[PDB]
Symmetry: C3
Subunit: 158 residues, 3 copies
Amino acid sequence: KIRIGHGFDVHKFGEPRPLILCGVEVPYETGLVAHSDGDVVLHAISDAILGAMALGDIGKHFPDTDAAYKGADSRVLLRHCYALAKAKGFELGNLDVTIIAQAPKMAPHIEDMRQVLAADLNADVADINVKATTTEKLGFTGRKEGIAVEAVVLLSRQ
Amino acid sequence: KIRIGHGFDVHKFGEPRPLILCGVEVPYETGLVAHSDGDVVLHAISDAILGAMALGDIGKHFPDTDAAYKGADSRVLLRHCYALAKAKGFELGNLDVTIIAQAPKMAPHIEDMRQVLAADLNADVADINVKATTTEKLGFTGRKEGIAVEAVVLLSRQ
Amino acid sequence: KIRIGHGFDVHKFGEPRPLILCGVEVPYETGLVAHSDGDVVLHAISDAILGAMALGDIGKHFPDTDAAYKGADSRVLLRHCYALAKAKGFELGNLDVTIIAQAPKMAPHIEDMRQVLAADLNADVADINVKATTTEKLGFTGRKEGIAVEAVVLLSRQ
Ligand SMILES: CC(C)=CCC/C(C)=C/CC/C(C)=C/COP(=O)(O)OP(=O)(O)O
Ligand SMILES: [Co+2]
Ligand SMILES: [Co+2]
Ligand SMILES: [Co+2]
Ligand SMILES: [Zn+2]
Ligand SMILES: [Zn+2]
Ligand SMILES: [Zn+2]
């Protein structure tokens, strides 16, 4: 059995702290506003994994009303979601992620991001893709208000 | 054979009628503007199912220019789409849906929404996921101008 | 083995040149700004194919800093991407594309667009779907500032 999932997340720029994206610190003038560490990339991937498994979403599992998650490293959340999939007998088929951001430039960090995911998903990096595009100065990402991320995943029984 | 589909839909708030989302009435000051009942969630799912089967989209099947479909119940339209899939020998593998909205609050309604889909797709609820995220006040969804939905589906032969 | 991919692209209107979408000239008062011919539909599909194969994105393979791609017909880029998949032992399972645009009207062009893809992907048109939706005058698409495209693909080992 193969199961599909989709994730989507957005956070706004403006938090004076390191910009951590897909577990990688990317140099920038500001960071992302969030309850947790603000890793919008890992959140979208986590929601895709929960989604594929019909386990709801990260708002259910890791609520922003709970101080337990304040400033949390989002790799902990990602690993929890993947562990739920593994406990149900599934593993990664393949993952494809699209970072939608006007800045910063993602290209120098893509490989480091793929390696974070290979480690946390106990996967071959050949089964993991991270991409980036701008929206050519259009919309909220084009105005540098924040970053959006889309992810799709296939999980397979084993 | 397994086949993938993707749906995306948006409607604007402002129509003085019940807000029906994934077949569930959610309390809100206004409803969604559309030719049919405005159920942006079922529309996106419908387009994902039509899309997986290479049958076009809801604009083709249930045209905005067509009086038959003025105020149409979107559960009826979803079931039309799924019946076309079944006629081609396919059934639901699994479905994951992402509601993108600042308001209303979706969490209290998720399970009711899943149960609507399990009934309308004659499917096990374990194969159906409905998620929601805000965009942290960014973009037209973040400003409560309307609601966006993304959906992905896998259909399998039998 | 089956592999999933997702692509997303946006370009802004305002280049005085033919509007080429999914390889098809669509009448409109202006075209799209881009380094290549600006075919946002083929770019998104290309990124889905690269993504499924974990080969990065069109920014990596066809950089905008490189004059070799200036004005390039985006069918060349799509064919390169698909050829990489074929070289790795994969072929099209099925493809579903969503053009997100307030104008121009896509419906008259959908079948021509599908035929471009059936040719370039050496595929049966029954495995190829192209959809369109508006965002009901919301956001940058709704304001007719540009066009966005989402695509999902399933590739299967040959
Ligand atoms: C946010 C979202 C649903 C992203 C999914 C992919 C995407 C950007 C699709 C194109 C249509 C869209 C939702 C545009 C957003 O305009 P905007 O909200 O950026 O416009 P505005 O703030 O300039 O009105
Ligand atoms: Co979120
Ligand atoms: Co629509
Ligand atoms: Co792009
Ligand atoms: Zn988040
Ligand atoms: Zn609709
Ligand atoms: Zn492009």
